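Hi support team,

I'm filing this because I wasn't sure whether my run with magnesium ion finished correctly. The job status page said complete, but I'd like someone to confirm that the output block is well-formed before I use it downstream. Pasting the exact inputs I used:
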Amino acid sequence: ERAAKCRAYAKALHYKELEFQKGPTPAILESLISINNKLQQPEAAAGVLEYAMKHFGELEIQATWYEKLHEWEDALVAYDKKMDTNKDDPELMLGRMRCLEALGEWGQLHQQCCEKWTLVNDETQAKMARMAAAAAWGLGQWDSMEEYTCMIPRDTHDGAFYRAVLALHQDLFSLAQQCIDKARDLLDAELTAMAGESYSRAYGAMVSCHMLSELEEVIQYKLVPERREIIRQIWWERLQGCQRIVEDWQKILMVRSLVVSPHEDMRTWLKYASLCGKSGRLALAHKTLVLLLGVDPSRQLDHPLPTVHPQVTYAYMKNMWKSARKIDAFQHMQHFVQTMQQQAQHAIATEDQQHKQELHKLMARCFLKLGEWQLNLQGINESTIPKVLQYYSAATEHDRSWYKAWHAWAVMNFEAVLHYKHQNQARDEKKKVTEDLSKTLLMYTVPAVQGFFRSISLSRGNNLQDTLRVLTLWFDYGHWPDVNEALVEGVKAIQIDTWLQVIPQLIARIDTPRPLVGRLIHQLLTDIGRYHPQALIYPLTVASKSTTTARHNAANKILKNMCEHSNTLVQQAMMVSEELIRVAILWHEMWHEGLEEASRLYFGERNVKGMFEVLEPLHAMMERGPQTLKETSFNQAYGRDLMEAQEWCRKYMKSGNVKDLTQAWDLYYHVFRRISKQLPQLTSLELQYVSPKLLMCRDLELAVPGTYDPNQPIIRIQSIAPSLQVITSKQRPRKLTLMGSNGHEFVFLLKGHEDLRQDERVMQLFGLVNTLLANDPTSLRKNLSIQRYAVIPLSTNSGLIGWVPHCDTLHALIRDYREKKKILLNIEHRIMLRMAPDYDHLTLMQKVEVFEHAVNNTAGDDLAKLLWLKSPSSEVWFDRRTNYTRSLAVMSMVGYILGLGDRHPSNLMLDRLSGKILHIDFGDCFEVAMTREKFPEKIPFRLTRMLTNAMEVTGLDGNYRITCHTVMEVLREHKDSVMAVLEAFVYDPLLNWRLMDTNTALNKKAIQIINRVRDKLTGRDFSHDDTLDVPTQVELLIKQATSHENLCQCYIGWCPFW
Amino acid sequence: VGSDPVILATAGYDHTVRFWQAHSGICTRTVQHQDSQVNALEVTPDRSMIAAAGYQHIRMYDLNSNNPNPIISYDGVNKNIASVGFHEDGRWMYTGGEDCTARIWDLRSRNLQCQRIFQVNAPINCVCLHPNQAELIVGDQSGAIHIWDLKTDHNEQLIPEPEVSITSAHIDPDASYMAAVNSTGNCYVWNLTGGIGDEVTQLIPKTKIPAHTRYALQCRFSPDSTLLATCSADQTCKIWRTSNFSLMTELSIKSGNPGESSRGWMWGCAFSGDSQYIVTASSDNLARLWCVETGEIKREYGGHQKAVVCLAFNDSV
Ligand SMILES: Nc1ncnc2c1ncn2[C@@H]1O[C@H](COP(=O)(O)OP(=O)(O)OP(O)(O)=S)[C@@H](O)[C@H]1O
Ligand SMILES: [Mg+2]
Ligand SMILES: [Mg+2]
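And here is everything the job wrote out:
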């Protein structure tokens, strides 16, 4: 029955929304926040209020709006403004009070209550009591509580509650016992009274039921003395666990206050004060801390801080920093740490080791703040570098373990290196210089390398960043002995597991010319070969078949080395990859692209030297003889013609005729026509004709491409399915499918002519972002993530891509819907051209009209609608949407940092079972798309009309924007991890080719790209001088993504109207 | 066709420049203008030939030889040409381009090249010549208006509200007022300190008229200097009084029911010589002759298949 109750609601929402579609009314808007709330969807409803605000300032009073937005702090100062200008007004006061009882401002709530007791209004007399009871509760004053409780009716759950508390204080336990049970029942009957359309009072019921059960434990804590440990444990655990907003925890602690004073709970209230600071409620955290110290809100401001309770002082100090007073905060630290090391070195008479330890770990935390604060106050320069390096080393001394400290020390050293290197490119822009430079850099490099090592071993699961950094120093430093020894040390020291994370980055430099670097790489790879080969074969096999000599040589060495222990694996892998490459682009498919290219150079460019270079690899390609039926069947129908078309070519090479060369093209154009006809006939490939070796394969020990991970039992290629559907396209990729040794099937897409190596790094980046999101509690609460797919490169030409089930391209879903509803697929386009035959050449202004014209005469539902019709129920429909909204927003931000261009409606798809969204084709990364000459993208990511429409009405204000901040906030917190990854492949040597396409050294261009990224992660993407906070930046972006001026400029294919 | 006292030219997306006889709505001649839409039309002060600024060219058809094709073409400039203007003394021509340049062309010599170039960051939408022939006013998409002294080559720039694109600018014959209109739909009016002849020529702000909610596309002073016209994407040409800066007369073409989705933008206007009448270019394929005082449609120039984005209107003896 319960699962069926939300169904009718979800069903009503669909219509209630559809109504709003036709005419937005305050009526509907009311019955919308409510239904969205029964559906326990808080943030989507928060979006409805945003729209309610921006279109109807009509439940009025800016203080009433701040109150509904739970922004009590703004509503309180907005109510004061409204009170001092106006009069008494009995409603303005209640609001002014509600703000105080949320904020936990008992001092002002009790005062406001008594000091204003004319209250001739009798309803003003009823509410008044409830609040002023709890206010009196927080302020100790029990007399006041009793008075104000005597005015709360025992009919209300509230009135029954405060009696249980008054009794428990005065020690009347039978009274207290009954009052609880009455308060429960008066709350049970009340949750059915407002059966859904209520406040966060259904969520605050858990607050009252929590408190009532806790208040029964406070009962347990009064006469029978045996649970003082059992009770404190649950109280302690159901806290670190529990995640209830500041205000609720106040109340919960107030229950525990009846029995334990904060001075015995310490750890409890320190954690609570710790939460208040993190959720930016400082003035409250302060008051909790002042209480625990038992000393002034330091009104004695020039005095030193008390060291009575080392832990509390520390909190205070960081509260002071996070507060306004941060030179002051810094100052108290230096001095506190000094007091702390003396309080150790002297006061430690042996029979106190636990205290010494806990005192040494506190200091490490102090030193880390010290360095960190020093940096924030001064920056990085010849004077700070040594200080913070001392601060961090000091932190490293006092905790030894602790990732934070070793990390901090590593990064500081690493940034010392950077500081001088970037200071020296400053010098060289305008012999004893380099010798002192080499001394300088070497001085910080070695410890950086060292630091990153001890820090990596302290993560284990979470060290992609630190690991990548190790490689930066390792590759960048053309190797000085000192830095090498440090590396070798570390490599031995740290687990092999680690490096798997980073295999493509290592293989990137197999052929390093620096002899000291290669040796370590080659050795380290070999050892990774020893434990976890599999993790190594595919990527090595690729490398071993490479035009560049130094690569494939060095790759074979490690492969040879791997045969000494895993030979038949190496052998299987070798062949499977070989055969797949043959299958990817068949013989005629190559001759077709090679004949087009050959006729462009000759008949359209007069280039016979370049043309001969297009055909000669194709002729020698067949010179080897056919090896498959499909190769021989080609060799029949075409072989002799070609073998003699070359004969004429090689008569002209020596004769230099032009009639010799025209006999060749006479023959060449013959086979072209033949093949071109057969090309739309390839819609399936059969293994037995195309590659028999692959059909032959049974129970291999090679793993299913990109399924290997330790932890998980190895899944091997047990069989390859005999047929491959050829996806008839421009590149005609194959849809290969493999049978796994676990039973389950594994489908891939075998692509012939796209260097998959980029797509691989992007998936790496996504993986990290996925962890980051899984680790941020909010992002986890919401399930936020990027769906990724396996990317297994096979050559520079080809590779494999994981097939994602249940997906259709945006373009497909639409092609279907429009044909279903008898709408011409490309109608916005045909409208635009009817209006303006020369659309592409119009001025900006001219275009926006035509664009708007198209949009205004075509439906924007499609996607929204086809998703409704699809769904088997309405809760399934509702959820698929929630998933869709969120996942799209995730990739909007992530995609932005990546600079992910070219997001036309065939490059993103929607999973039809969860509704979550999926991006493919990562060819255009970093500003590339926007920098291009012809049709430059103006868009940061596609937030197009049908995508907007498909979310909830009140779209962008709701789930989308909220999720946008969340994701972005995570990305900014972890800006280095993200940049470690991104730096790794902007500067990757074999990957730099995708930016020299700005034509249609690189050292300088690569610098730009990465800055443009840091700019985005620091909120400096827009103006050079501002430093925009998240919601500003997000707003700016959504704006940009939505601008008609931007969209109308998009290459038509991009479908700026879908 | 230039021999008629009244020259009326209409150009747009349908590859023709049609000429009309003002008083009757009959289309006189029509000229082929293929490969591009027409961005601006201006008739030379000499009444000999009309200029058609388009995409990467300014073609110039002859009003006297009553028949042929472009006398002169100008080329070798990439992206659109948005504004044209002529200097009284027969020989100079000015242009604003998407290529971010204000160019001065010598009509009495050869060269696809232009005599001068004034480059800005961000594309130029409008270019107009102060009646003193000594200064060019140039509005760009960043929102900067540039006064470019044609003598000192001294550039001086002024931005109003902008981070917003200024769409057109104009300056009354008596050089007392300068106006500029932008994409927000605002209209800015400045007072003109007639420095001139050993020049200063200063701009003093007077009002910002909230002329439109949507894009404002052109602005123009009557010969009178009595009125200021403002064409917009809200399908409206609003005529403002210069004494008041209040709304005298609204000309509009917007359905008569909210469920129509518009049909047509008010792309351009030109006043008649006597400031009594006003011509109107719209995207609904028509030019229109209005009576400035009544706001009465006195004629409708039907002909163009596709949109109309241009007018030129001439009254000289
Ligand atoms: N990771 C994937 N999961 C599921 N389906 C996919 C995946 N990648 C591609 N497809 C499907 O395969 C079709 C072929 O598109 P692509 O994989 O991009 O090949 P393509 O022919 O190179 O595409 P271009 O370059 O845009 S013409 C797409 O329309 C998708 O439906
Ligand atoms: Mg694609
Ligand atoms: Mg592709």
